[PDB]
Design an enzyme around this catalytic site. Structure first.
Site, PDB file in Angstrom:
ATOM      1  N   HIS A 150       0.787  -1.226   0.000  1.00 29.71           N
ATOM      2  CA  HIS A 150       0.000   0.000   0.000  1.00 29.71           C
ATOM      3  C   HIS A 150       0.828   1.290   0.000  1.00 29.71           C
ATOM      4  O   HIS A 150       0.780   2.109   0.927  1.00 29.71           O
ATOM      5  CB  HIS A 150      -0.877  -0.150   1.201  1.00 29.71           C
ATOM      6  CG  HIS A 150      -2.033   0.830   1.375  1.00 29.71           C
ATOM      7  ND1 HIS A 150      -1.878   2.183   1.413  1.00 29.71           N
ATOM      8  CD2 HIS A 150      -3.357   0.578   1.543  1.00 29.71           C
ATOM      9  CE1 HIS A 150      -3.053   2.740   1.662  1.00 29.71           C
ATOM     10  NE2 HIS A 150      -3.939   1.787   1.742  1.00 29.71           N
ATOM     11  N   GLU A 248      -1.190   1.458  -5.052  1.00 32.93           N
ATOM     12  CA  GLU A 248      -0.977   0.181  -4.425  1.00 32.93           C
ATOM     13  C   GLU A 248      -0.835  -1.015  -5.371  1.00 32.93           C
ATOM     14  O   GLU A 248      -1.663  -1.213  -6.277  1.00 32.93           O
ATOM     15  CB  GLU A 248      -2.137  -0.134  -3.497  1.00 32.93           C
ATOM     16  CG  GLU A 248      -2.501   1.001  -2.564  1.00 32.93           C
ATOM     17  CD  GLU A 248      -3.784   0.802  -1.773  1.00 32.93           C
ATOM     18  OE1 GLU A 248      -4.194  -0.352  -1.601  1.00 32.93           O
ATOM     19  OE2 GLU A 248      -4.375   1.806  -1.320  1.00 32.93           O
TER      20      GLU A 248
END
EC number: 5.1.3.15
Length: 269
Positions: A150, A248
């Site tokens: 992320h 991400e």
């Protein structure tokens, strides 16, 4: 906001406690990096000559044991988002161990491992630092899993960024609807969208810091583009969204099986 030296592994690699959490500090010809052992989480990476850190870390980050760090490259595993609680799984809230470090003239390799409470390997993360940053996550779990890197990228101004290379459609988690979209894409509002990973390269053009963050993903199935914009977000100041954007690397709908990895290679141009 207190730091203490815990251990001098080599002249270029130290372990430093930030509040509650141990963080490795790397200072090498190739540049500098900081990796929290909680969540094996890279939180800073400034390759040689880069004027700004490549990654963003919340200016109000608490560094509290067991509380996900806001910024850097959190490892979401073995589930993604709020499909269960805690959101994003347990990897990013559990201490990993540094199982290997290799240092040489033009490259540095660190390996982290996550173990089950039964003392059996659960996951691995490797990070390779050159002029680029290659971070790979591998799953050694019991069942099929989701995972995501992320990544929070540090930028000059959310109003001056373009995202190049993503599809012209994506799924909008905001309103749970598939929608059409521009490429390049700019961010002028709260964006929380999942793209299919058609092509493994995308890049983030920043005309405020005047650089391009280029991304070469491997084994991704989904790419999540996210900026909370005006939503209050735990661990983010009210002004944080202006200096960050998440792109991400993810395996959300295509699960990971035992020994499969997913990774991203980050570089500036």
């Amino acid at each position: 906001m207190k730091t203490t030296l815990l251990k001098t592994l080599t002249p270029e690699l130290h372990l430093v406690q930030h509040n509650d959490i141990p963080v490795l500090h790397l200072k090498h010809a190739v540049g500098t990096a900081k990796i929290s052992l909680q969540g094996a989480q890279l939180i800073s990476w400034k390759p040689q000559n880069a004027k700004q850190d490549v990654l963003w870390l919340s200016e109000v980050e608490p560094f509290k044991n067991g509380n996900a760090i806001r910024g850097g490259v959190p490892i979401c595993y073995p589930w993604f988002g709020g499909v269960k609680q805690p959101a994003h799984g347990t990897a990013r809230i559990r201490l990993w161990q540094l199982s290997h470090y290799y240092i040489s003239v033009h490259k540095v390799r660190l390996e982290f491992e996550l173990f089950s409470d039964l003392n059996i390997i659960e996951a691995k993360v490797s990070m390779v630092f050159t002029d680029k940053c290659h971070l790979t996550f591998t799953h050694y779990g019991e069942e099929s899993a989701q995972a995501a890197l992320h990544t929070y990228f540090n930028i000059g101004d959310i109003n001056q960024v373009e995202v190049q290379g993503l599809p012209e459609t994506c799924f909008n988690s905001l309103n749970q609807q598939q929608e059409n979209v521009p490429s390049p894409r700019h961010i002028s509002e709260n964006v929380d969208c999942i793209y299919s990973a058609e092509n493994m390269q995308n890049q983030i053009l920043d005309k405020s810091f005047n650089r391009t963050i280029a991304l070469h993903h491997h084994n991704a199935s989904q790419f999540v583009l996210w900026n909370p914009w005006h939503k209050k977000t735990s661990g983010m100041s009210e002004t944080g969204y202006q200096k960050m954007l998440c792109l991400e690397t993810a395996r959300i709908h295509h699960l990971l099986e035992f020994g499969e990895s997913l990774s991203v290679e980050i570089s500036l141009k």
